[PDB]
Amino acid sequence: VSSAAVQWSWDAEFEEVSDDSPEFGQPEIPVKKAQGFVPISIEALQDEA
């Protein structure tokens, strides 16, 4: 969740205040996948050192 800061102002005596509504936002992060694969032979896995 992200947001800004309220905006103040300088006002004189007997002056109505402005509307200061902060605006929010939401960052978002997806998750991906990576893979590898190396085959091997029964002869090779056994005879190679």
């Binding site: 005596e13 007997f14 002056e15 109505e16 205040v17 402005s18 509307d19």
Partner: protein
């Protein structure tokens, strides 16, 4: 009802927003009249109009 005073905490402005002011409200109630107008005598000095 006798004199009663209330303290308004927030006055508003044209756009229905606080303007930074406060007030005091005070009121009372009564009423009166004459039941019989013959039980009195009053003197009237009429000047030239």
């Amino acid at each position: 009802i006798g004199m009663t005073v209330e303290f308004i905490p927030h006055l508003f402005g044209t756009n229905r927003r606080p303007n930074g002011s406060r007030g005091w409200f005070a009121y009372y109630r009564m009423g009166a009249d004459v039941v019989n107008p013959n039980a009195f005598r009053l003197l009237n000095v009429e000047t030239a109009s």
